[PDB]
């Protein structure tokens, strides 16, 4: 039945190993590409090694402590639109696992609410089968009987939520002015973001699960008042016929929002009158390549792909949300279904027109660079067409030519992104440079300029990879820069604070893991420490660069012990390539 | 030309999805100024099912299938569309007669309409009260006609 | 000089007795009516008695405790516009005095920042001489040299400010991840609002002073980047000539906002191009009555006043902000300057036209009822024209006739306001009923319906006054209702919580003060307690209605002792009229 | 002004071509009730005289004199009688209505009853002049500067 299928879904979801293998980076599992929320390159940043370690070792012995350790997340900033920004907070892995274990032991408090709920089309999290059109069917069924539709949307819901209002929603505000499940969940949520009570750390499955529980108690209240609507996260569609219905709904909705410190985005409040508008229809996009077959010339294929990209950008401009994100999946599916030869795939995507100087892969790459949220979409598309026959060397040469041709614009874009803390836009350029072996856009002293403050952890890792890939460069101008960065970061905390509970936890772990595997040769680190006259000790040189000294510094060493167990057992959080040489093609 | 690239060998789920998308497409077309685009929904669904040579068992499966997880039935969507504009009463009822001859059993359609009316009983009762107070003759006529027929 | 005059202003302002006599209710002192922020009727709600008590007694002996007691403020909701709402939080008097004393002892940390500041036109707080046109002159001087003006506005600045970000602004975010002035000020601010770290308690001078200090450190950062602009609270005007100037300013402004968790209201972001638009010009309003003299007939005066009200409402509609609030002051000033006889004042404002059934005072009253933020404006205007000659009995009869004529609409408005927690709209109607002796709009069981939950403290006090004014009614249907309300309110707190640190502190104090002065006869309270079978004790009947029993209940009695000292010394926070009979005309 | 008291919102309604398209036989329907008209009296004789003034044409009222305005005012005063029996308050000048209200349910109830009366009496609403004024109210027609 409905309840059995929901119970199977939530039994599969509410598993700690699942919530770290796919939960941390907000991936989707299809069996035991629209709603896909994947925002980090799986080939570099994944939790496969950590989840493999978890399957055979229980780490709950590290979270027996009463008070949750307060840690600092990775601050990653992504574009909301062409002008606005959205702030992601990637929690410390220790804090993430604490919250993960707590939610998985208290799964009963989430599942029953999710089961009883009727209004949410987002309580399935784009998992195994409950992909987008099924939630669309649920919305359709919920919208029956209404000649009018009222659209409501909370403004900055994730980023401005008062974290202490979670017990107010779950248990009642009054019962909260007086230990329990909601209070402990609140403490763990704030511990994931350094005791900050402003917002929820966004960008993973646990945050979405907690937000869905919060909004499902919202729905519980609003259905107790005998209302019916469809909600996706914080977007409400309320079907109604009579204006008194809308006014009563708005009154109760406003009371609940005001009581819970929620702000309504009044710019998105609209009423649709029947006949209803439906801008986001994908039928034309999916049927764009119906009248093209594998017997057509490769030039026809190139022209149709270019026209298709232009068509989808126009569709996105015309209000068809998500139409650009459908470009890559349906190009891949068309090439796979139409049975196009591998030599033909290579010819289509590698052909450079002698007179127009036009290459279709370069057009797709430029499209990806126009919106940084298309980074993983582009890279997945490239992996697919690489398996189809498009050689990796030709793609690398095309991307090299693009970067060389647009070097001035790319350098000033990097300067802008680094000045303005545009984290994902910088991450995309450095990720393309790492993946496609771009070894001339930035020289040595520009690469060293990215290892500084206000640079996100993933960008720092990608810059370090770019520095290590170039064997000409000397890793002492790098060790000095990294050590200075580590010292400056620790200078912002109390001296009795463990380093892995601070900012740059992921970049620190990257560096110490690389040091243990001896990509940073111990001889040259020793020479650098001697140059800086670092006092030796029982277990090293007492520098920020020495994990043996760092792992025992601080009054509270729970995160240090956690990450020491990961390092000792050779668990990597950043993939160094299939041959440990930082090559990803 | 909405159903050009669909054939009788396609799965019934594909047929249901295409009919739902087609209804949404026609409502959008009517909204965009294409006068009479909703009134073309029923005739071309009927003509498509007749031309594509879809089996009677398949007709019954398409229009009677109730999705276990989304709780979605396409006949219920068409019925709701008909109830949104009372001028579509005879269009809906003619369409139902056609698909009844095609294989969609009358008992299943009656059960679907029963479920819709039971689910939306509150809204329908207040609509009847509004229509009876305001002398909205055809809107009341449509609801009572559906009650009599089904 | 400039600095000496600013120093005199801030020496006068930063005085605890000043910050309670005018600070608490956000009043303005002219010598030792535009920007006036007065939102509560001075004749009922004032701190004259408390400030008089302070001048002769030092209450700092009550705030020697280390940990600030966390108290619950009075939640008062006022309209932001015809559709939106603004939330006021009137702090507990104990918490208010704690924060007041701390700010006055740390005045040096505010004054130097205010002195050095250049960009703020709001760091004067509409005090002695620094009224609106002088801040306009400051803005004009700051806007020199710019052919273009960029307007920026933070969205929901007071109500969504993260209170822990105050140390980030004042001391630097980095120096805050490590006792000081900023941390203690943060603790006191959160204690004023029951440890809630979401927003600043709005509606008093201390909150405006702290907000100005926060924004003056904002200005300090932005001027260190060599920018020039004019800011009023959170409204920025940035003069510029070249687009690179605007882009650089927007970049740095966005960085500071993002770092400090501040949200920009993108709907109010506009660029004015020269020639500049100036909608808010008051010259026509002030010159409306130039060609009218005291020798004109009273009918001419009535017609001109009516036309003037219509003109000002139109001006407000056309974007002339604050044009309606100028109606009452300039009518009063015109009648005073034109030397109109007192008999003529009475004739103008009391004449009821026999055929049109039109009275100008009724029109002004209806205008006041259209926007509840005009309550105090209307009541001040009525006091002025009452001194000018307009008899109080005639005004009471006119308001009686209006309320009787519109009784149905007013009753359904009261029901709407009470259901939707529209605090100021209800407060205005009950205040008009109390002031003008309206004794028939609500009967006994409707009056008792307002003494319930989700009703603000001032509305509860006004309803109690309306009940006591009617000598026919029995105060046992009132004592039962109040006791039930007190029990229900205390049921939402831990049993070891002192009652004066809870919600409804002001209404509780009102009731106990009234009981000590014997407006509630002790005999009838005793009879009610016996009817409810309340167990007696060493010091009373152990009911919520007995201050002798309540004052010693709770683990922490600092607020109880404070308010006990106020009650014992017969300090009133609600004025009972000049003759202690609740009559205010 | 006195009639518009108590309303934070104003709804403006206007009948379209009221004088020129009025069905003259609907005057007894308004004055006496439509039902009592499917069965000599004052209203019938007034209707006959009105049509005689315009050559037995039953389409409109002869416009441009005081008698036509008096009859139109009587017609609309029976309209007002019905609408006040339903406990409504508004200001009407000829066929221009200003309805003061605060809550949207008030406006919807008023529009429902107003539409029923118009439909029953063959009256057409000028939907191009239907507007809602929100406070602060607009006042374009002010003659102070001219005078």
Automatic annotation (TrEMBL), chains A, C:
It comes from Lactococcus lactis. PROSITE patterns: RT_POL. GO terms for molecular function: metal ion binding. InterPro entries: DNA/RNA_pol_sf (IPR043502), RT_dom (IPR000477). The modification Phosphotyrosine (covalent) is found at residue 34. This is AbiK. The keyword Transcription regulation does not apply. Mg(2+) 1 binds at residues 153-154, 234. Residues 2-313 form the Reverse transcriptase domain.
